[PDB]
Design a protein around this ligand. Structure first.
Ligand SMILES: *CCC(=O)Nc1cc(C(=O)NCc2cn(C3CCC3)nn2)cc(-c2n[nH]c3ccccc23)c1
Length: 282
């Protein structure tokens, strides 16, 4: 079903001209920021040109296939609807604030652990939902694929390489495979260290292959102990950053980790902290 926008619990018969274009948005690719004239809702609309790249359009249709069937997951970016015109296809995604990568740039420093705790519970349950409900492997987990908004929500972005990735967050066994959902556990751990310290773990790398050598030759980059990080946080990163993929835990035991169980029940106001950081901007 296309041509219908479903914001909240109301379905509106919409058209491409019923959306007011408010300009394009900067993200990993063509997503527009639009305003539904009949309701006033600001939504994200990515436009897939019919005469576009067949390889890029294939990646757009792959993630939409996963996004559409991920409606019962609260940690995946939702699709409000689709518009199939004669020359274009418009996918209406929900509008969020920014990604963890750009949030790292505006912060110009580390991200608090209490914010990464809610983020950790969100991304793990999002990846676990993909492996169980649809057998989907993200294979490209990185801060650029972790969205946030004013309401304090944290969600997963888009899986254009998902199967039933960036070389900077690639798992050790993805570089030298013997003879795999645990590959994203490493990518998540590398993303956590980058956000918890404000610096990429494998620095001073001018080549993608040089990053691959440091993953295999050097020890996994754990969290520093002089920043006040909790023991449960350091235990979660150390478990996620296990070089031997056979010893790295799956999402089942990751959910049973004490660091996850803390921020499932803890009340962390991600909404107020998000508005304060975005206020200080260039
Ligand atoms: C990693 C880069 C990234 O995530 N970029 C990104 C930016 C924005 C964005 O800047 N949106 C503008 C905006 C406007 N508001 C107020 C105006 C009243 C609402 N808040 N943010 C948005 C998104 C984004 N949001 N949902 C998305 C779904 C799929 C892809 C991107 C996306 C991303």
């Amino acid at each position: 079903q296309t041509g219908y926008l479903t914001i909240g619990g109301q379905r509106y018969q919409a058209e491409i001209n019923d959306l007011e274009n408010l300009g394009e948005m900067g993200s990993g690719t063509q997503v527009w920021k639009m305003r539904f004239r009949k309701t006033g809702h600001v939504i994200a609309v990515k436009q897939m040109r019919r005469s576009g790249n067949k390889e890029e359009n294939k990646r757009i249709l792959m993630d939409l296939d996963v996004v559409l069937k991920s409606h019962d997951c609260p940690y995946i970016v939702q699709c409000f609807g689709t518009f199939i015109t004669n020359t274009d296809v418009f996918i209406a995604m929900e509008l969020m604030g920014t990604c963890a990568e750009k949030l790292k740039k505006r912060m110009q420093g580390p991200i608090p652990e209490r914010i990464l705790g809610k983020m950790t519970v969100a991304i793990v349950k999002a990846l676990y939902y993909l492996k169980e409900k649809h057998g989907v492997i993200h294979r490209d987990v990185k801060p650029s694929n972790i969205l946030l908004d004013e309401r304090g929500q944290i969600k997963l972005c888009d899986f254009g390489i998902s199967g039933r990735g960036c070389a900077a967050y690639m798992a050790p066994e993805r570089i030298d495979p013997p003879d795999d959902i645990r590959a994203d556990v490493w990518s998540l751990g590398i993303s956590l260290v980058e956000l918890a310290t404000g610096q990429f773990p494998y620095k001073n790398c001018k080549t993608d292959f040089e990053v691959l050598t440091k993953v295999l030759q050097e020890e996994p980059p754990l969290l520093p102990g002089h920043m006040g990080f909790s023991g449960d946080f350091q235990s979660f990163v150390k478990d996620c950053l296990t070089k031997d993929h056979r010893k790295r835990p799956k999402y089942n035991k990751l959910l049973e980790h004490s660091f996850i169980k803390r921020y499932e029940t803890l009340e962390v106001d991600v909404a107020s902290w998000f508005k304060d950081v975005m206020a200080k901007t260039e």
